[PDB]
Design a protein around this ligand. Structure first.
Ligand SMILES: CC(=O)N[C@H](CCCCNC(=O)CSCCNC(=O)CCNC(=O)[C@H](O)C(C)(C)COP(=O)(O)OP(=O)(O)OC[C@H]1O[C@@H](n2cnc3c(N)ncnc32)[C@H](O)[C@@H]1OP(=O)(O)O)C(N)=O
Ligand SMILES: [Br-]
Ligand SMILES: [Br-]
Ligand SMILES: [Br-]
Ligand SMILES: [Br-]
Length: 317
């Protein structure tokens, strides 16, 4: 059986799908279907400090040369008339309690994407928010203190995770996407999951940061690249932060003394080797090469079926 449900379970996937299905049960909409959430890749990675920051802070011993993290890919599926549809995906980076500062106990969203066929329409955004809030709830429980989001929509015609979106799925502009994150985070605050959140500039100001070495350094993020582009010739950094403040969310999960003397992060879930889902490139390539598209409900369901066969058959022993 090559179903979504039959993909191996994880504590995280179970936590998220239980949150979503409980939410759906509360809404009691006759058209909602069972949601399945699965983590389909988890691996150890490191992010190397680029040359320039390496020459400036690493070679002096002020900063680590690299930061270890775990990457996880997760997907959500909904049953519609008994057929599974993959409608949401996310790649995250998790920096544990053993990781050197400035990255310890932080999570970062690498990529998030969706295809707009969730049934019913009126619960789609709500379910996306339930997944995101659930993710923050879960990592807070593990002892991660801070979440980080670069709220940047894809460029015209580009796909983050799913190949060939529906032509009529509008892509939000920056302001709309920013507001979307504020709505999600305001809900999380009301549920006492998030303590508070700040834009990157306000965060740096309140922290009284005085050196670029203090800013969290994530794989593929804007800030390592802008630090390199700036270094070609700290006040620059502050200026760049103010200019792009509204794009970058810093989400405080644990505050005050509660954040001070935490035990180590222990993740109960094992690594999950899966080359197909090691970052976003391999799945886009599979979809492109096999002429799969997520461009209509029926096409998306077909492509979901094909994705599932490949996930199961890559995983077999
Ligand atoms: C390297 C570099 O330089 N740069 C980058 C840096 C990478 C950063 C990566 N960061 C991340 O991944 C985190 S930010 C997440 C960004 N991901 C995406 O945006 C993927 C494409 N978008 C989506 O999947 C969805 O829009 C989603 C974000 C899931 C929200 O779906 P939704 O449905 O809840 O809300 P809605 O979409 O606002 O729609 C809600 C309503 O708004 C409507 N709507 C949406 N957009 C528009 C619009 N443009 N104009 C008018 N209306 C509009 C939509 O029709 C709808 O109407 P209704 O409810 O009446 O039907 C790089 N690495 O390449
Ligand atoms: Br509907
Ligand atoms: Br609607
Ligand atoms: Br909580
Ligand atoms: Br592959």
């Amino acid at each position: 059986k090559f179903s979504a449900k039959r993909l191996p379970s994880t504590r995280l996937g179970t936590f998220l799908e239980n949150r979503v299905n409980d939410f759906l049960r509360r809404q009691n909409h006759p058209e909602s279907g069972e949601v399945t959430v699965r983590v389909v890749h988890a691996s150890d990675k490191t992010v190397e400090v680029k040359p320039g920051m390496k020459a400036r802070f690493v070679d002096s011993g002020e900063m680590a040369e690299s930061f270890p993290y775990r990457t996880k890919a997760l997907f959500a599926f909904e049953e519609i008339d008994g057929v599974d549809l993959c409608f949401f995906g996310m790649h995250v980076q998790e920096y544990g309690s053993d990781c050197p500062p400035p990255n310890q106990r932080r999570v970062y969203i690498s990529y998030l994407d969706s295809v707009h066929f969730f049934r019913p329409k009126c619960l789609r955004t709500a379910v996306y928010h339930e997944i995101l809030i659930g993710y923050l709830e879960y990592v807070k429980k593990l002892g991660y203190t801070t979440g980080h989001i670069w709220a940047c929509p894809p460029s015209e015609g580009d796909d983050y995770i799913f190949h060939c979106h529906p032509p009529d799925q509008k892509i939000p502009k920056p302001k709309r996407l920013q507001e979307w994150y504020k709505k999600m985070l305001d809900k999380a605050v009301s549920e006492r999951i998030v303590h508070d959140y700040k834009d990157i500039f306000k965060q740096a100001t309140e922290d009284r940061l005085t050196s670029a070495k203090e800013l969290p350094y994530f794989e593929g993020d804007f800030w390592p690249n802008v630090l390199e582009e700036s270094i070609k010739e700290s006040q620059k950094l502050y200026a760049t932060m103010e200019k792009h403040k509204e794009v970058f969310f810093v989400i405080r999960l644990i505050a005050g003394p509660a954040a001070n003397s935490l035990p180590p992060i222990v993740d109960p879930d094992p690594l999950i080797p899966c080359d197909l889902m090691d970052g976003r490139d391999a799945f886009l390539t599979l979809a492109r090469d096999r002429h799969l598209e997520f461009s209509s409900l029926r096409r998306a369901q077909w492509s979901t079926g094909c994705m599932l066969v490949e996930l199961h058959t890559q995983s077999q022993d």
